[PDB]
Symmetry: D2
Amino acid sequence: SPLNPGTNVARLAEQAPIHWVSVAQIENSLAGRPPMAVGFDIDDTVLFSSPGFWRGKKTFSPESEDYLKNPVFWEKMNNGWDEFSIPKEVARQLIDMHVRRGDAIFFVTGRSPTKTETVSKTLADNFHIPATNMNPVIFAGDKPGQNTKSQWLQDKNIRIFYGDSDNDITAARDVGARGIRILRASNSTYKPLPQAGAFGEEVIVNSEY
Amino acid sequence: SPLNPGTNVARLAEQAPIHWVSVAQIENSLAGRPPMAVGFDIDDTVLFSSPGFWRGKKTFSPESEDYLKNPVFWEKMNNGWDEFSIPKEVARQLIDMHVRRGDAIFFVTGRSPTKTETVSKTLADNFHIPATNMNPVIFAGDKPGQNTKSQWLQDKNIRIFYGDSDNDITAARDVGARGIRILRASNSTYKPLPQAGAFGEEVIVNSEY
Amino acid sequence: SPLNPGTNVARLAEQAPIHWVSVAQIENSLAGRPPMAVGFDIDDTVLFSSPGFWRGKKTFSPESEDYLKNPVFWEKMNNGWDEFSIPKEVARQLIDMHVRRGDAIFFVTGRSPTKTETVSKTLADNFHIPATNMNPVIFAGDKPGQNTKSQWLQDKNIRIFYGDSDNDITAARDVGARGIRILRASNSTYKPLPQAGAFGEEVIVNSEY
Amino acid sequence: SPLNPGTNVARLAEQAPIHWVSVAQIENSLAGRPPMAVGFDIDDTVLFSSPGFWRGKKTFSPESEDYLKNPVFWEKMNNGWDEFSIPKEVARQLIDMHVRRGDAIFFVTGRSPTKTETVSKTLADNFHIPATNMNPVIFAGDKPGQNTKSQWLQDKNIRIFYGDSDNDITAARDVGARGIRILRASNSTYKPLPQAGAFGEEVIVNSEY
Ligand SMILES: [Au+3]
Ligand SMILES: [Au+3]
Ligand SMILES: [Au+3]
Ligand SMILES: [Au+3]
C-alpha cells in the first residue's frame, strides 16, 4: 500500500446504489395506517452492546469465540451487562415515532436464552416505552424450545422489522414484512460490518449512532 | 468562516436520504418488459453543453442572461456548438441498454427552436443510436406552436424520463412516467445545481460524468 | 427540514481543509529519530470508555452532569469499569509502532484521581505494552496536588501527544510538542463531537475505531 | 459486480491521507511575504479545456490519440477553441489573491506550440489579470527550441506552481518550489484522473470546478 495513495474527484463523489431513507420518510410512508406490530433486533440496532460482548470475550475466551456458547457468559450478558450498552439515537427516534402511532413494539434477538433476563427492562427504561406498547424480549433461534426469527415475525404479525444484520433483513423478506436496515457502528466488536443495502432494502441514514 | 473549520466523523459519514440506483438496477427492474418509449433531457443529462452556453453568454450578453432570448445565439448553439459538448458516460450506458432492449429513444429539450438543428445528428452519432431507435429532438416549451414537455411525454407514451432538472422529474410525475434523475456536473455553468432526490425520485449514482 | 432534501455533486465531493495523515506516514516522519517520550490521552483516544460514563451518568446523576464531580463514580470508573471500554484500532497501531521504535509511552488523562486505579493495568494488558515502555497513568488537571496536562508534557519531554479533544491539541501546542488528533466516535456519549483539524493539526484517517 | 453491493459506515467515513488546504489557508501561509513569481498549469488547472480536445479528437483522430501530434489540431486549439473552455472557480480565487499580493503570474503548458496563440489573451480576459501581473503563456517541453517545465520554473524563479498532473507537482519538487495540486474534473476527457496527493503535496479542496 502506497505511503501517499492520493485520491481523485470520481472517488470522492462516488456513491453506492443504496436506497437511503430518513425516520421522517418512514413515518410519512405510514401516515394514516392503523396501529400494527413492529419489531427490532437488539444488538447494534437499538443497543451498542459491544462493551458486554468485549468483556465476555476477554473473560471467558480471550483466544476464541467459545464465550458465545458459554452459559456463564450469557447469564452475565442478559442480567446486567446491558447497563453498559449504549442506546442508539436512531432507535430512540424510531421507537418514539412507533409509540406515537400506537404500534406494538417487539424485540427479537439471537442471544442465547437464560434463566432470567433484565434486557426487556433495560429497553423499556432506556427508550421510555409505555408498558402498553412494550413486549418481553423474544429469544429466537434454532435450538429446541425455540422458534426462528421468521416464525416469530409471522406469529406476532410484525409488519416492519429493523435490524443491522443480513439475517434480520432476510427474516423480514421471508414473511413479507418490510425489512429496514440500521448501520452497525464501525467500533462494534462484531466484524466484519454487514453490507447494508445488500438486498435492495431501505437503509436508515446516519443510523450508526 | 474559520481558517481551520475542522470536521467530525458524524459529518464525514453523513448521508442525505436519497434513493440511489445503478444502471444495472434500472435494467433489472425492466427485465421481461416489452419495448417501450423512453426519453432523455439533453443538457447536463446526456451532454455537458456548458462550453457552448459559456461561449454564448460571453459573446451575446457578458453582463446578463439575455443571450438565452437571442435567436442569433440559438442558431449557433443548435447548429454546431454541440461539437464541443461532452457526452456523459452515464448516458452512454443508459442509451446502450435501452437500444439493447429495442426501446424507442426520444430527446426532449427546453432549448429555443431554430430554423434547422444538428443536435439530433450529434446525439445519434455520439451515442451510436441506430436510426430505427432514434427520433428527432423534440423542442418543448410554452411558446406558440409548441407543446410542453409533459404533453410530449404523454403524446409519445414515454414510460421513463431521465433528466437533471426539477422540471424534468415533475414532468414525468405529471403524466405518471418514471422520472429518474442524473446529477448535474459541478463545473456546469448552469447554477445553482439542482437538489437531486428532491421529489423522492431515483437518482443514478456517479452520474455527473 | 424538507422530507426530501436531495443533494448535489458539489456537496457529495466537498472536503473540509484538513491535514489528514496515516499511521504509516507518521512512522515515516519519525524514521531515524532516536527513542523519545510520546503521550496519549485516554478517553476516545485509545479507549471507547463511554460505556462506563454512560453507566455512571445513569446511576449517579440521570438528570445532570453531577456524576463527574462524584468521587463514588470515579472510584467505580477507575477501578474496573474500563473492563467494558473498547480499545481503538488506531491506538493499537500507534502504540505498536511506538513500542517498535523503543519509545516511552505515557497516558495523560483529565479523569478525577482516586485512591487506587486499575486503568494503567487495563492499558498495558489490552495494548500489549512491555513494562519497559509503559508508565503509570498521569492524572492531570488543575486541582491542588496536580499539574496540568501541558506541565506533564514538559516534565516528561513528550514530543508527540495524541488526543481527541481541543485541549489535547492545545496542550501539545503550548509546549511545542506535535499534537496529533484522533477522531471521537459518533456513538460516544461525550457530545458535541470536537472539530478535528480546528488548529491546523494533523488528524489521523479512519481513527474513530 | 453485485446488483446490490451495499455499504458500511467504515467505508462511508473512510478518508484518504491527503493534506487538504483551502485558498484562505494558502493566503495565510503567504501573509507578509513580498511579491513573488507564481505559476499555473493551464489544462484542468485553470481551464476546463476538454471541449476543444474532445472536438479535436473527433475531427482529427476518432480512433486514436494521433490528433495530439497533429499541427492542424494545435493551430485550432491555441487560436480560438479556448472560447469554449470553462474557467475554474478555484483558479479565479487563486489568481485574484495572487494579483492582490502583487505577484507575477505565469502560465506554463505542455500544449504543442504554434505559429500564434490566443490562449494568453483568453486567460488575461477571463481571469481579469492586469497587464502588469500577466505574462505570455510559456509552452514548455522537450522539443528542440524548448525548455522543460522545471527549467522555466527555475528561470522565472516561480515559488508556487499549481497543477493537476503528477508532472506539475514533480516539476515544482525538482526546483524546490511549492507544488500545489488542483483536482481534475471527473468529466474531463483526459483519463485516468491523477491521484491528487500522490507526493504528499497540498491539494486544494473542492478544486474540481
Ligand atoms: Au444485530
Ligand atoms: Au438538463
Ligand atoms: Au479524550
Ligand atoms: Au493540466
